């Protein structure tokens, strides 16, 4: 209302995992968004374990959200789906059974998948690494930058558990400088 905003985030747990249950059906009729956590994603080490394909949000429409945000979201989701399909192909055929387009799609999908992980401020009292609060602008800009494959050279292991996208480039360049120094010192012996 004009007085303010009351936002609600409601946790639902249906015993026996039945989402056609009348309680689940009744509650889903009011949800404007869903955050679905995946056990497979947690097993792979993706934290938070939010599934970006099974979940949905009604705010990804033209009535509210800007066109570029919708384009970025759609491209990210379809790239993740194609990457999953190509990884299923890879696990049987092998990596070098794809063309260059498929390999680029796989690389972009992997970097998108590991870019979505993030450390939490509320969990830094037993993990050491400080948490992050990435603004929407930074998230959109970094996802757009990764989408075009502008960082496909940077190893995938650098992407995990980071905030803004620029920290990836900083870490990569620092490691490259240290490796260059070690190579120069290795040639001096």
């Amino acid at each position: 209302t004009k007085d303010g905003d009351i936002t609600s985030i409601q946790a639902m747990y249906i015993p026996a995992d039945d989402f056609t249950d009348p309680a689940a059906v009744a509650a889903f009729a009011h949800f404007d968004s869903t955050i679905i956590l995946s056990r497979q994603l947690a097993a792979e080490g993706v934290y938070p374990a939010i599934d970006p394909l099974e979940s949905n949000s009604k705010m990804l429409s033209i009535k509210y959200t800007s066109r570029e945000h919708l384009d970025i979201a759609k491209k990210t989701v379809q790239t993740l789906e194609k990457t999953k399909t190509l990884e299923d192909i890879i696990n049987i055929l092998g990596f070098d059974a794809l063309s260059e387009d498929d390999k680029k799609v796989v690389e972009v999908g992997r970097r998108l998948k590991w870019f979505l992980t993030q450390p939490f401020v509320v969990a830094e009292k037993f993990s050491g690494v400080p948490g992050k609060f990435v603004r929407l602008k930074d998230s959109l800009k970094g996802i757009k930058t990764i989408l075009d494959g502008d960082l496909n050279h940077i190893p995938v292991s650098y992407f995990s558990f980071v905030g803004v996208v620029e920290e990836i480039i900083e870490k990569f360049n620092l490691d490259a400088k240290k490796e260059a120094l070690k190579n120069e010192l290795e040639q001096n012996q």
Partner: protein, 260 residues
Amino acid sequence: MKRKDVEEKKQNLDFYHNYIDISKIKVLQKLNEEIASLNMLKLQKGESHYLLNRIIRKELYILIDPKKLDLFSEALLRKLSQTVKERIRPDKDFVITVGTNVDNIARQLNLNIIDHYDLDLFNQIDDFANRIGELVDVGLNNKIFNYVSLLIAQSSTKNNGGLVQERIVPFFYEQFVKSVFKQELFEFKSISVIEELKIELQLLDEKKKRLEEQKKELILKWNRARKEEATLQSTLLFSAFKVKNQKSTRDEILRLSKGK
């Protein structure tokens, strides 16, 4: 939707699950047989090389489409299209295409299609090898082409998934050279069959996984449906009992309302 039908479906799924293990055993045995034969073929090819040595750029690219059409075959076909677009020129190279897919690929690239065949010809090695040997002898006598290679849209384990390929040429003179060509073609077909059998084993494992997932889904649906039906039946049965005792409830309500 009765428990009898669910039991029949689950017994069919379990029978299929066992049969897939049996198929794995059979495929492994056939793979062992094929490898044992291929070792002898390799030794015979080496001996034939030695005996030919005792008795002694236009390329004919030959492409072969995969056995079936699925996601793996489509990915391999697009990789083959990339490779052909890379290392084939329409002026200095001639392409022999068997199967609709590679024929369409060549026609789209407008390469020099000397002749077209049918995929079933590859099923029997003798006829395909004989026709290819006659064609290459005709081409070499006429000096149309120099090098000969074979491409099959099929993944290979030794290449980390790369397409199987080998340049046979270069490496009664005519009879000996023809026999060497035939032995080379036989070896190539045997290698292709070996890789196909390994892929088939992995596909069998995938099929077993799919069967288990189907069984889980069927269990879920049966449980939900039976719960719903049982609850409805119990409520409908109690409806009669609760209807038949309305007067006692109404009289109790009256006498409680009056009370003291």
